């Protein structure tokens, strides 16, 4: 089967329809998503509100060929998986990367999927180190992904997904299986986009995934390409115009669109702040 | 026993020390609190950040003789009950009064107390209809309080709070027993104080409790006195100055204080917005 | 002559082209504008940034059939008068209606037009009591307008404008002939839309003008119609849906539009804040 | 003569009273100020409103031993010069350093002083390159200052200002002699502290002046000392604690104070955003 939405979803993912909800279907859609729809925080910098209702998400991520973060990406992904027939619901977790003194709020959205009597967690909105393939809800089991090795962890009642890096695991974010509501994400988005100390307000962030363990990475003007998890080439874009171009070339950002588009002069004012 | 804090706490509550954590101790401290420390949202209107660390709370609610809401009030209360020896932790719930189309975020804080092998919920920061006495965690049981009658539903794991009104139970807000973290309150406060559509940014709100089922109520210039739950006297303050006075008289607001005080001209700019 | 813009301008004003810049041309375009493009502050309440570059103005006020305030309205009007050949530039003035203790900032934009060796001030963005016809820059001279009587008094190189209200004269606002720059308006808009105590953030405001001294007035749910300056009929809209309708009927608001439109659920969240 | 204010002003300036308003008095007070009261934007980063009424200025800049920027510094300075008997009023100008495409708003405050039948412009609030000694209102005349050579200029009613950079002249800000009102500064401060793209919201900025053409410079963790206009020593502070210390040592920031003080943990949250 294929709903109106599900249609342009597959269309944007440069992928072929799927009607049967199976671990393999997930496996691919995930990577598809990860390569098609970039991780971007540009609506936060050029001041511009982020709606999270399936429609705004549809018109932003699909039609306008734009990106987003936690809430937007997994919000769209959640819809797709649902229309395809899977059993999903979002979850909120705490970003603990920076290794904070005290647990932070529920800033990160992620998906919980029930496929073939097991429970997996799909997440395409974590940015740089996001997963690129579902993982099973189990501790220790060093799971594998097209772009890395991760390890969940049943600590009491809050799982602690962590990944392999430089000979040992790093915590990325903790969460629990508690239900969440649309508003809980709206609040999550509100925090992230408006709390003065939120990093998302202090630098442009883009990240797109490629087929063979490769990925792109923009952080203001610092562009970087990776292959099989290695830093191959690192360009430092020299100007706004040049960057405006890089956004459309490398990440395939829909710079035009009656609604969600944005002039190049706007990208200039945004980078000007830094 | 009595800690430095616990000291000025009792001092502000115009109450006598208590060292033994029992339902009765709770019973009274609750009402004490409800009558001494007013519910106020003034720091939200005159723009002015709300810290929630025990110290800012101490200096705002105790020393400066000021009020606050959910987060501040129950934040202070939680500390006290803790220092007195009780077993407490905060909980976040969703305000459903307005009977919203879809569940709202975790805007409200409240306390869970374990006294004599049972579980009670104390809450002094809900404002107008806050409880004025602990309640037992049980369904149907129409519980009684110095200022009203409440009933807790048991919809799943989550609970709902209600109170009588025209011979029919009315739900105030829902909530479950999930753990919360300081940050979760900071986020709650952030939402409440800064989300554009938050009602707290559109009108002054004050509310203080009196011994015999009475309470005071300000909503901008509309002042109201209540006895045994009845509207006895309703004055419509005519001017800023007059109101400035009313805040100190009726609610016992510490209008002066190196830090948390505020001029009367400031209150004027605040009410000027409306 | 007629530029691409000037085209849809006249089209929105349900008016016939004009190519000769004369006091009479001004006289009508002013009233035209005043009846076609409503005074609205809706983008301020549903959080949504207000661009002021001729293009955003064009797309919002003309194509989407929406309204605006000081900055937007006169901004569009200024362009028109310019393309028609007049001699115009904006001015910033201080809103003194509330009769403030100390002069407020330059919140209000207005136009200065040099027609037939004289200087006139056109202003369609003041809302409720805006002018509806150019006025001559001269003191005492009680000038006449389709919707009221005005007057100009002196106190420096700065100008004060008034209108006879209840039985006599009283100040509306002041300003001076100093040059302004786009950014100065951007700042003016930033203030008005974001300074916490700005009244525009605390209630919906709409106002549209009618041919024979009549006008429409919305303030949240309070709708009011006026004839020859008199309150004929005052309805108190009972619900969001009904109001959503009233916005399109009475004011002719373009509720749809890829970009500047807004759902009715959005208007509900906005009125929910109050 | 010496007013209550003027008293602690001199006390903070580690300077001896002056009662006669002369170019020489200005000459020194300026340098005095420039070395005593640092240029700081810390209240912008840890969210915290900036009042500009003489009293808040007094309590922040003098009693709490804290710094500020444009509005606060020159605001305090203006009061002093006034109480001492000079003839002063503030002016607003536009920061053109970055060499913007179009004129920016009136972000910068500065002083205009009438001493011995001439007109000078004093400004202690511009930060890094602020003046350190009055200048005469005259074009071309390459004027000299304890920390640099500034050439003023013309171009219509406006005046530009520059300093020898590299060796070519780099326009700084610009302005006109138009009157300004308190609100005009409040709006200016509003812009600077809240407009999302304002650089002041993206990094900590501190700058203090020293006696012999030397000055200190903090930009986040990049500390720098200068002598006779040369970069002697550049330390890159390694941690928040260490920086907290550097603020009190090198710039003499009053880190404590019932009101304007700030914990070290607060500084951490601020730097954490970057």
Q: Which of C231, C203, C206, C246 is nearest to C37 (CA)?
A: C206
Residue B156 · residue B178 · CB < 8 Å = no
CA-CA-CA-CA torsion sign (B263, D270, D273, D202): positive
Token pair for residue B237?
Answer: 């303050």
Alpha-carbon gap, residue D84 to D15, rounded angstroms = 14
Residue B92 · residue B180 · CB < 8 Å = yes
Residue B159 · residue B175 · CB < 8 Å = yes
Phi, psi of B9 (to 5 degrees): -70, -60
Which stretches does DSSP call E strand in B165-236? 169-175, 205-209, 215-219, 222-227, 230-231
Which single residue is written with the structure tokens 């998503």?
A33
Token pair for residue C258?
Answer: 């890829």
Query: Concatenated DSSP letters for C221-250?
Result: TEEEEEETTEEEEEEE--SHHHHHHHHHHT
Residue A71 · residue A189 · CB < 8 Å = yes
Smallest CA–CA distance, residue A102 to chain B, in Å, is 8
Determine the distance from the C-alpha atom of residue B187 to the mean position of all C-alpha atoms in its chain, rounded to a whole number.
18
Q: Which of B28, B49, B186 is nearest to B122 (CA)?
A: B28
Determine the distance from the C-alpha atom of residue B25 to the mean position of all C-alpha atoms in its chain, rounded to a whole number.
19
Q: How many Å from the N-terminal Cα to the C-terminal Cα in chain C? A: 48
Alpha-carbon gap, residue A36 to A210, rounded angstroms = 9
Residue D173 · residue D108 · CB < 8 Å = yes
Q: What H or E segment, with its residue span, contains residue B242?
A: helix B240-249
- Count of residues in chain C: 274
Q: Which of D77, D99, D101 is nearest to D174 (CA)?
A: D99
Alpha-carbon gap, residue B261 to B221, rounded angstroms = 20
Alpha-carbon gap, residue A194 to D172, rounded angstroms = 31
How far CA B232 is from CA of A59, B216, B217, C142, D245, in Å, comes to 55, 10, 11, 52, 58
Cβ distance of A98 and D202 shorter than 8 Å: no
Residue D262 · residue D255 · CB < 8 Å = yes
CATH number of C37-50+203-274: 3.30.1120.150
Mutate to test the interface with B, among C101, C102, C197 (most CBs of B within 10 A): C197
Among residues A108, A147, A209, A260, which one is catalytic? Answer: A108
Rg of chain C on CA atoms, in Å: 18
Alpha-carbon gap, residue D161 to C69, rounded angstroms = 36
Token pair for residue B134?
Answer: 């602990």
Q: Which of D169, D127, A256, D75 is nearest to C259 (CA)?
A: A256
Q: Where are the alpha helices (DSSP H) in chain C?
A: 4-12, 23-36, 42-45, 56-57, 70-83, 182-194, 240-249, 264-272
Residue C213 · residue C146 · CB < 8 Å = yes
Q: How many Å from the N-terminal Cα to the C-terminal Cα in chain B? A: 48
- In the 8-state DSSP scheme, what is residue C203? S
Token pair for residue A18?
Answer: 């799927």
Q: Which residues 6+ apart lie within 8 Å of B165 measured at CB?
A: none
CA-CA-CA-CA torsion sign (C92, C96, C101, C107): negative
Query: Concatenated DSSP letters for chain A?
Result: ---HHHHHHHHHTT-----S--HHHHHHHHHHHHHHS-EE-HHHHTT-----STTHHIIIIIIT---B-HHHHHHHHHHHHHHTT--EEEEEEEE-TT--SS---S-EEEEEEEETTEEEEE---S-TT--SS--BS-SS--EEETTEEEE--EETTEE--EEE-SSSEEE-EEE------HHHHHHHHHHHHHSTT-GGGSS-EEEEE-SSS-EEEEETTEEEEEETTEE----B--SHHHHHHHHHHTS------TTT---HHHHHHHHHT-
Which single residue is written with the structure tokens 């949202």?
B41
Q: Which of C140, C24, C164, C158 is nearest to C91 (CA)?
A: C158
CATH number of B86-202: 2.40.128.150
Alpha-carbon gap, residue A143 to C112, rounded angstroms = 70
**CA angle, C111 then C115 then C121, to 5°:** 25
In chain B, which segments carry CATH 6.10.140.1930?
Answer: 1-36+51-85
Task: Describe the strand order of the beta sheet including C222-227 as a list of residue ranges.
Answer: C39-40, C205-209, C215-219, C222-227, C230-236
Chains in touch with A (3+ beta-carbon pairs under 8 Å) read B, C, D
Residue B257, class by beta-carbon neighbours within 10 Å (0-12 exposed, 13-18 middle, 19+ buried)? middle
Q: Which residues 6+ apart lie within 8 Å of A200 measured at CB?
A: A41, A44, A69, A192, A193
Residue B137 · residue B159 · CB < 8 Å = yes
Q: What is the 3-state secondary structure (H, E, C) of D39-77?
A: EECHHHHCCCCCCCCCCHHHHHHHHCCCCECHHHHHHHH
For domain A1-36+51-85, the question of CATH label 6.10.140.1930 is answered with: yes
Cβ distance of B105 and A178 shorter than 8 Å: no
Residue D64 · residue D257 · CB < 8 Å = yes
Residue B73 · residue B124 · CB < 8 Å = yes
Determine the distance from the C-alpha atom of residue B62 to the mean position of all C-alpha atoms in its chain, rounded to a whole number.
14
- In the 8-state DSSP scheme, what is residue D196? T
- In the 8-state DSSP scheme, what is residue C62? I
In chain B, which segments carry CATH 2.40.128.150?
Answer: 86-202
Among B49, B258, B259, whose Cβ lies nearest the Cβ of D47?
A: B49
How far CA B39 is from CA of A34, A208, B129, B255, in Å, comes to 48, 49, 11, 15
Q: What is the 3-state secondary structure (H, E, C) of D101-167?
A: CCCCCCCEEEEEEEECCEEEEECCCCCCCCCCCCCECCCCCCEEECCEEEEECCCCCCEEEEECCCC
Among residues C30, C33, C108, C209, which one is catalytic? Answer: C108
Cβ distance of C201 and B273 shorter than 8 Å: yes
In chain C, which segments carry CATH 3.30.1120.150?
Answer: 37-50+203-274
Token pair for residue A75?
Answer: 């919000």
Mutate to test the interface with C, among A43, A44, A259, A260 (most CBs of C within 10 A): A259
Cβ distance of A202 and D274 shorter than 8 Å: yes
Residue C35, class by beta-carbon neighbours within 10 Å (0-12 exposed, 13-18 middle, 19+ buried)? buried
A174-A177-A181-A182 Cα dihedral, nearest 10 degrees: 50
Q: What H or E segment, with its residue span, contains residue D235?
A: none
- In the 8-state DSSP scheme, what is residue B139? B
Alpha-carbon gap, residue A186 to A53, rounded angstroms = 9
Active centre residues of D (catalytic):
70, 108, 123
Method used experimentally: X-ray
Name the pairing type of β-strands C205-209 and C39-40: antiparallel
Q: Contacts for A15-21 with beta carbons within 8 Å, 24 or more apart? A: A18/A84, A19/A84, A19/A85, A20/A85, A21/A81, A21/A84, A21/A85, A21/A86, A21/A87, A21/A115
A266, closest residue in chain C (CA to CA): C51
Query: Concatenated DSSP letters for A181-214?
Result: -HHHHHHHHHHHHHSTT-GGGSS-EEEEE-SSS-
Asked about A70 being catalytic, the answer comes back as: yes
Asked about A108 being catalytic, the answer comes back as: yes
Which residues on chain C place their C-beta less than 8 Å from a C-beta of chain A?
47-49, 258-259
Q: Which of B233, B265, B234, B267 is nearest to B253 (CA)?
A: B267
Which single residue is written with the structure tokens 């009007």?
C77
Task: Sort residue C117 into left (φ over 0), alpha (ψ -120 to 50) or beta.
Answer: left
Q: What H or E segment, with its residue span, contains residue D189?
A: helix D182-194
Phi, psi of C21 (to 5 degrees): -65, 95
- Count of residues in chain A: 274
Residue B19, class by beta-carbon neighbours within 10 Å (0-12 exposed, 13-18 middle, 19+ buried)? exposed
Alpha-carbon gap, residue D262 to D258, rounded angstroms = 9
Strand partners, A109: A92
Beta-carbon count within 10 A of A229 CB = 14
How far CA B248 is from CA of B49, B56, B239, B241, C235, in Å, comes to 22, 21, 15, 11, 39
C94 contacts in D (CB within 8 Å)?
183
Alpha-carbon gap, residue A226 to A246, rounded angstroms = 16
Residue A62 · residue A76 · CB < 8 Å = yes
Would you tell me the crossing angle of helices B240-249 and B264-272 to the nearest 10 degrees?
A: 120
Token pair for residue C119?
Answer: 């200087």
Beta-carbon count within 10 A of C53 CB = 12
Write down the number of H helices and E strands in chain C: 8, 13
Rg of chain D on CA atoms, in Å: 18
C49 contacts in A (CB within 8 Å)?
47-48
D199 contacts in A (CB within 8 Å)?
273-274
Q: What H or E segment, with its residue span, contains residue C259?
A: none
Residue D163 · residue D149 · CB < 8 Å = yes
Cβ distance of A105 and B191 shorter than 8 Å: no
| CB hemisphere CA count around B157 (13 angstroms) | 5
Beta-carbon count within 10 A of C244 CB = 21
Determine the distance from the C-alpha atom of residue C157 to the mean position of all C-alpha atoms in its chain, rounded to a whole number.
25
Beta-carbon count within 10 A of A208 CB = 21
Alpha-carbon gap, residue A148 to D271, rounded angstroms = 31
How far CA C234 is from CA of C152, C210, C212, C242, in Å, comes to 32, 16, 18, 15
């Amino acid at each position: 089967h294929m709903t109106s939405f599900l249609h342009a979803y597959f269309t944007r993912l440069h992928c072929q329809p799927l009607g049967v909800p199976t671990v393999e279907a997930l496996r691919t859609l995930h990577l598809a998503h990860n390569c098609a729809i970039p991780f971007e925080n540009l609506d936060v910098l050029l001041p511009r509100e982020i709606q999270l209702d399936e429609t705004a998400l549809e018109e932003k991520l699909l039609y306008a060929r734009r990106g987003g973060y936690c809430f937007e990406l997994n919000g769209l992904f959640e819809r797709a998986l649902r229309d395809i027939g899977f059993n999903v619901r979002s979850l909120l977790g705490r970003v603990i990367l920076s290794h904070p003194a005290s647990l932070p709020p529920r800033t990160h959205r992620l998906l919980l999927v029930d496929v073939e009597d097991e429970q997996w967690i799909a997440d395409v909105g974590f940015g740089g180190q996001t997963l690129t393939a579902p993982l099973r809800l189990q501790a220790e089991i060093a799971q594998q992904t097209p772009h890395g090795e991760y390890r969940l962890m049943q600590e009491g009642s809050t799982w602690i997904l962590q990944f392999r890096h430089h000979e040992h695991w790093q915590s990325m974010y903790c969460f629990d299986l508690g239900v969440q509501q649309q508003s809980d994400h709206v609040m999550g988005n509100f925090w992230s986009a408006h709390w003065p100390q939120s990093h998302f307000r202090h630098h442009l962030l883009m990240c797109r995934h490629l087929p063979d363990g490769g990925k792109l990475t923009l952080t203001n003007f610092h562009f970087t390409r990776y292959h099989q998890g290695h830093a191959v080439e690192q360009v430092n874009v020299p100007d706004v115009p040049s960057l405006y171009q890089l956004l459309q070339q490398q990440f395939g950002l829909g710079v035009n669109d009656v609604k969600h588009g944005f002039t190049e002069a706007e990208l200039a004012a945004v980078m000007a702040a830094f």
